[PDB]
Ligand binder design. Sequence first.
Ligand SMILES: [Mg+2]
Lengths: 266, 87, 116, 223, 270, 203, 244
Amino acid sequence: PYPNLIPSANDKPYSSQELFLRQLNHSMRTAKLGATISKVYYPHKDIFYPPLPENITVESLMSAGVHLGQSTSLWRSSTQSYIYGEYKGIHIIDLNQTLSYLKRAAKVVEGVSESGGIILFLGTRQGQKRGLEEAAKKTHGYYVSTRWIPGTLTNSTEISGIWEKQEIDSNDNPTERALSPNETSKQVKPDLLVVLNPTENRNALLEAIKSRVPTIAIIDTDSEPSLVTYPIPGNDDSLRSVNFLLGVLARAGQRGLQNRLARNNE
Amino acid sequence: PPVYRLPPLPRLKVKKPIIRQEANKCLVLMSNLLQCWSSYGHMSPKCAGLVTELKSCTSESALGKRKSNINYHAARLYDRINGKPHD
Amino acid sequence: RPKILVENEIGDENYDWSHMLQIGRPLDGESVIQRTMYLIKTKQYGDMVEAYDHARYEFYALRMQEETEQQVALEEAEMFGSLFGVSAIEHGIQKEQEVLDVWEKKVVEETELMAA
Amino acid sequence: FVSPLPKDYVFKYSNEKLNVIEACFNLSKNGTIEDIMNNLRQYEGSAEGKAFAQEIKTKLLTKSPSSLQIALRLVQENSRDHIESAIKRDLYTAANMCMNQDSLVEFSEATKHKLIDKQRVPYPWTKKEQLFVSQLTSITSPKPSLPMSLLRNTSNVTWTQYPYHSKYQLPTEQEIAAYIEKRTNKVTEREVLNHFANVIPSRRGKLGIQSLCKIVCERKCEE
Amino acid sequence: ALEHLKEGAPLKGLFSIEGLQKAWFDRVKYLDAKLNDCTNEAQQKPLETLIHENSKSASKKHIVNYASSLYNLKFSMSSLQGCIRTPPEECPRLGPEALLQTPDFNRTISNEPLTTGNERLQAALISSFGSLMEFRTLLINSNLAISGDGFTWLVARRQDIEYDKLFILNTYNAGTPFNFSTSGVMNELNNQYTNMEKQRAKQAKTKFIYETQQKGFSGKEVSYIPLLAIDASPKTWLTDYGVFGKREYLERVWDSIEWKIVESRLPQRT
Amino acid sequence: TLAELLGRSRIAQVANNHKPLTYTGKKFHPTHQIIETKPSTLYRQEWGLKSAIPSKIKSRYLVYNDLDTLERITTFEPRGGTQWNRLRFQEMGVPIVSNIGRQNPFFKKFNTEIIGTGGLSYSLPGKLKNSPNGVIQRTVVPGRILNLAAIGGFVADVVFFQSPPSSFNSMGDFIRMKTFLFEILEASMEKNGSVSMHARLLE
Amino acid sequence: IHVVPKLPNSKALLQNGVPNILSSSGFKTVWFDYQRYLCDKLTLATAGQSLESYYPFHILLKTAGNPLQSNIFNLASSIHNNHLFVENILPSAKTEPSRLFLSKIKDSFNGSDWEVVKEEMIYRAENEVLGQGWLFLVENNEKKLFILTSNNNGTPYYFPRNQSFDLNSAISIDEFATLKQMKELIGKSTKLNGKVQDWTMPIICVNLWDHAYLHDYGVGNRSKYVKNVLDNLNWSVVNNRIFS
Ligand SMILES: [Mg+2]
């Protein structure tokens, strides 16, 4: 480690790099020392250590901010059943309902991962990218943060024509043999589209239902819930609530992947 | 107070956006000189430095030095800022 | 007094409103109100207003204690040769100064414009 | 539609209490209520567990002896045999209780005392002795004097164990023990939990299953 | 030194048979011996006078500090008396829950000067502080805040030995409650430093600020007549009350003040 | 129930108001609850509100009215200046006392009027403040003269022995540039909730 | 919420204390109660602030420059310093001082022995701090070590909050000059917060508060306690917190 470090002379003081290394060493050993800080929210911890669908409660959802629906004046009355009441000039999403729908969604995510399906996480909002990529990594899955070019599934051959396809084991090993030009040009459709802002990409949803793909979406109090197969009522605007739901879904899919790998090994 | 909600429009844009830049220095100097010459007769040495300053300003060209993104924002944020009811 | 709205685990907490000072929670009007509600529930003060007043009075003492703590800590620091590079008032003055400088140049230009 | 249990939740039956129950209530082919009582009396271990055992002996004493004996007689037979036969046996013993020829099950009077007359105070009882095995059999068996029959179902099916319970509830100690044995023929607690909480498709999202498994491990197996 | 306390049987209110000794008898011995080691003279004399003589001097600093430490403790103990509350040896020590208890100083009031005469003193306190309760809160909270070796002082602003207005101040380790002895030492040091630099403006502004901080409304300097001292150091209260029972200790102290002595100390008003 | 949790929770705790965020009139005390984030939460745009807040905001503090509006934007202003005014006041250490002969309200149907001070100072008046140099009699604070003087987030009435011409008349309406020292005498608080300080110009 | 960390062989410590330097009761007073109290105080101070998320050391570093909120700094400083002291104490988690450490000492103190250095440290402890405080042996950006006393909750890390000498008492000319130089350096920093750069690291913290010694050693014998601590401390820990 640190092969190019030119250490200063013993008579001389520390160099800048040497000093930095010393600081790092101190940080690793004795900085986080005096106390330990239990019961506090670190944003990163929801992405890298999301809870299982089972262990989620209503309280956790409330803390995440999932309960906060759009607004009283921006109400799609189609979503009436999901909403608990109004408060602070804002519809508040029934969170027991949210929980049950999330569990249902989580189970279907797990199932397709187990079957070895292509899961696609779609999230066009600003802060969502990193968490989306993490989720995609967790299950051997896919994501979209930069905008969804209309017709990725309906007009697949024009759009997704010149990108490399692969082969895969019952495990996830590339088994790198040459794909034939006929073998390459076929569409590779997702087996689960999961969106974080269905109201912002109506188009993607429409192609999914045309292309015959089951889809999951965070339905806020202004979003149409009929436009998807498995709606999760919740707060799609705040970045952390979305991440929490997304991270849970990723964890559910991860589990199913692990189970598939285990059964392959067997 | 009386709020005024517009109907659904094709495109919110100001027809012409004014930048409101500062007036030219050379022009100002010329106006000052003109004002001075209104008083004090035709060309008395009270405005001896002013004329020199004007000359310095208008040596390379008649004027010394030679847009507001408001439409792009309106265009961007119209769909948000609408109180347009759902689809 | 700034308020963090980003929730920590809402399920984890467990506040006995016998007293105001809870651990995870800070001292604020909320804590007072929770105390008032507790009093109402227990029927120590049957009336709501009286319970509220009591909670307010509990809060005040705590606030005074907090105020005294900081001042004395500052005094101690001053005594034992601690050195603070920028005090709050000094910082404020500095902040004002930049704004004033910005204003002055602009104001001179505006006066010149008006003249001509 | 399930939800996790609260963070203040504690499983009522502690480990030591479960152990003492196991010690006392486990019986041989010809076990009795008297034998159980004796076992409870002579149990030795933790102080709290001993106190618990004493308490449960007291409450057994408070309850009726003949009925307890009948229940004891029934339960081993029912464990051995299949559902329909067990149900029939239960029906027969209920009939016998209703129409006591031998006058050795003071039931109707006890019911009157409790349900009809007054909620408070236990019944004094007028019959307290060790019934013979043949007598017990006669009590919980039919005769040609009265005709007896269950009403016919659409699905007239008979089985020794339940077809659909084992999948959709928390897994028994016995199943865990069997799994452990299979694994042996290293093993650890975390691995067992993973197997139970993840690998088994019916019991992936079981609520308090990991905790149950941990309790089982604490009770039975060793490092 | 003092009469009201002894080695065998301490006060029923505050300290215990061992804890009192740890607080007072041992500390005093440690200090006196240290003072003797520092200065060849064995004559006690007055402590205040010695402090005045040897103040504003780095060489004669330790001795001054030890005199201050001795004097302050003595002043604290003179004020104290017996109490109604039970001894801490009988009672249980306070745990972590003591921190979360609301203080009753805002709402309750106890042991006032009025109950044992001392009417003019009480009136003076009221004039200074608005009320008795307000004064008490100022005192106890300040003492709590000190968090370390220190003393909280009730003082009187000396302009016969007349006074203008009562006040309260904290002072730490071995700091004197008398202002005149240490007033402007820092300014003098600054001036010396400036002279040294010259030998080898902002500085002028800082000096001016120091001067205006120091100088009173009229007189050339100001001094404070101490009326009440209350120690804040762990040395005293850790033995009986543990870590968490500082506030409790202070409450007990407050309950067991002999206000007659304080009244006597208080001079005539202008 | 969920409802109970909602009532408890940190958004319910912020007492609602629809007062202007831009109020060009006289500001005697804070209008809105200041709301801070942590740096981490700011980094992923989360303030504990309904929505994400724009990445353009780099300040940790803000003020708001509506969680969500018809315009599909939270009504907020990224500023928490009122905390700094309070902190400045605390630093100055001039204890607020009622100039009228009345008991301190913190000691002992609903009255909406301000109970004593609004909570900018819970300091008590009887204390002195010692330092290495000595016991501070006169509180030295730097401020700016406007024409009244701005002294650490508060405007204050001023008095002096003689009006200095050299500093004033050299720059008649650019007196705001030069910071002068002040000796703050006392701070009174009126019924409207305005802190009426009184300073003295030092030279 | 800030809670005290679980020490290694905690039950053993509770039973005994520390073999040589601290009793069962004396160790409880310094750590199992006092540390807990400190943590609780810190939590109370920093419950709803942004400081709740940060560790004590990082809180202290954040806070150091701010004159107000000195209480938080004090608490954070105490918590960190006290745990450093406990780490130094602990029997295990026999070890000798490192060769490198000895060489560094020799370089620093004019080629003197480790026993001599210890003696100088105890003398400094005796003379400098009145009342409460801390006694550090630190290392700075110049590789040589030096002895650093602090007067109650003064940190070894950041030199403006070293809290190294008491101006409540009278001070020297040299000390005043040093203070003036420090102040000048601080003013030269030129940042909005106004915080200098500093790379001082503690190698041997010792707790000169009465929460450690007063139970066992009485009101006197603080020097003796310090000596005992120096004699019996975890050397492996010290060695670990030495090299860059
Ligand atoms: Mg939305």
